[PDB]
């Protein structure tokens, strides 16, 4: 289980990250839970491998930048 | 595992963010990793309670 807490990110970056995680969760057969507050985006992915987590984290920094 | 990602934070704010999480992980006995990548600060904690996770999220949001 991997949880991301993205702080004060763009609305377009949040959209690209959510869609990227949903595609990864669909192909891996797991489900992802999103939570949104003002400036804080929660992403909780059950049963995620370690290489997938690093990939999601690198893509997050790519689109948030 | 929980991953806190901050963007364009000052080194002043980076020290406060890291110091806050360290004593939390020091009290719970959990692994914590701090990684800097240009204007990004990654705070990765393992097996941290959601009660503590919301605390860190509220502090980092007030810091950022």
Numbering used by the authors:
A (entry chain A): 1 to 65
B (entry chain B): 66 to 129
Please share excerpts from the published article on this structure:
We instead sought to use implicit negative design by introducing three properties that collectively make self associated states unlikely to have low free energy: First, in contrast to the flexible coiled coils and helical hairpins in previous designs, we aimed for well folded individual protomers stabilized by substantial hydrophobic cores; this property limits the formation of slowly-exchanging homo-oligomers. Second, we constructed interfaces in which each protomer has a mixed alpha-beta topology and contributes one exposed beta strand to the interface, giving rise to a continuous beta sheet across the heterodimer interface.
We determined the crystal structures of two class one designs, LHD29 (2.2 Å) and LHD29A53/B53 (2.6 Å) in which both protomers are fused to DHR53. Aside from backbone beta sheet hydrogens bonds, this part of the interface is supported by primarily hydrophobic packing interactions between the side chains of each interface beta edge strand. The two flanking helices on opposite sides of the central beta sheet (blue and orange box) contribute predominantly polar contacts to the interface, and are also similar in the crystal structure and design model. Association rates were quite fast and ranged from 106 M−1 s−1 for the fastest heterodimer to 102 M−1 s−1 for the slowest heterodimer LHD29, which is still an order of magnitude faster than the fastest associating designed helical hairpin heterodimer DHD37 (10).
